[PDB]
Amino acid sequence: HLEAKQKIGFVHGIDGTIATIAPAASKVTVPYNTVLEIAVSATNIANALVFNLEKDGSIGVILLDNISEVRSGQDVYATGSLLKIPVGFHMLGKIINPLGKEIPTGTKLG
Amino acid sequence: VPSPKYIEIYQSDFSRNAYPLELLGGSHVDFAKLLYSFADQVENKKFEVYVEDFKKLDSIIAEKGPFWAEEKIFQSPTFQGLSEGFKFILGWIQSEGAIDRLENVRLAYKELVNEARKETTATVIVAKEPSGNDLAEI
Amino acid sequence: GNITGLMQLADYTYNKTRKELITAELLEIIGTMTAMHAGKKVGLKKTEFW
């Protein structure tokens, strides 16, 4: 209802899994080792982790998922938190991705 | 054809001068800072002039085609309408091959202008045509 | 049988040293090249064009 998305810039370069994010606005801050959400499409969203923050505001990023979908003009938003996954008894019995996505077959974040 | 005052600003160092906001980036920020120096000193803070030039420049680009770098801005009938200081910066950009970085420059210049007037710009996108009732709710 | 075993150890060590030397020469060349690339300035170096 009130939920909003925070934009830190656009992509400038991609090389395989690695990527570079150019800031949209000065005096914007991204914390280190935080996951970032790239605007792949109207509904699809990627996820990617920082590894360095440069003097120029440019940000190095490791793309964790949906690398084939990432492009240069795409938006980049900040979750503002470390990379976390759901954990608990409920996760048992379920094959999953590292991030937490369930891979199909035939609340507490750690 | 460049004016002596513009030459004096370019020959001098403006990177170490004070500006309303600190700007982050590579080399595009320097082009934007030069635009601001012109608008503050000789044009007497008529910032929107250059903001108009960018708009005008966009239209010119479409008529010129994608390879508008190669043409000289200082003697170009299409660029005659634009202001001389804007041409100075485009020529410096052309000399350094930064013309592909112009969009980053216009964003930087807009941020500096926005601070100098202490104004923040927000963008809204509609599907086809805006409606007044939706605008009032927005 | 003992000579065979010695020969297989010698072959493993020879090929290991060969690959390690190839990697070492590669990392040397990339290092000298990388240093040369690092010795390039990022300044605008602006000059008059009129």
CB of A9 within 8 A of CB of A72? no
| Interface with chain B: mutation pick from C40, C41, C46, C47, highest number of B CBs within 10 Å | C46
Q: How many CA atoms lie within 13 A of B2 on its CB side?
A: 22
Nearest Cα to Cα of residue A13 among A74, A64, A54: A74
Residues 6+ apart with CB under 8 A from C20: none
A93's torsion region: left (phi>0), alpha (psi -120 to 50) or beta?
A: left
| Helical spans, DSSP H, in A35-103 | none
Amino acid at A54: E
* B96 and C CB contact within 8 Å: yes
Report the alpha-carbon angle B12-B16-B17, nearest 5: 80
C19's torsion region: left (phi>0), alpha (psi -120 to 50) or beta?
A: alpha
* C39 and B CB contact within 8 Å: no
Amino acid at B72: K
- Cα separation of A75 and A52, whole Å? 19
Give CA separation, C11 vs A78, C1, C14, C18, C20, in Å.
54, 15, 5, 10, 14
Give the distance from residue C37's alpha carbon to the nearest chain B alpha carbon, in angstroms: 18
- Cα separation of A81 and A71, whole Å? 23
| Helical spans, DSSP H, in B12-138 | 28-41, 47-64, 84-96, 102-116, 132-137
Length in residues, chain B: 138
Task: Indicate yes or no: CB of B24 within 8 angstroms of CB of A24.
Answer: no
* PDB resolution in Å: 3.1
E strand or H helix that includes residue A48: strand A47-53
| Interface with chain A: mutation pick from B22, B23, B24, B29, highest number of A CBs within 10 Å | B24
Strand A34-38 relative to strand A59-65, pairing = unpaired
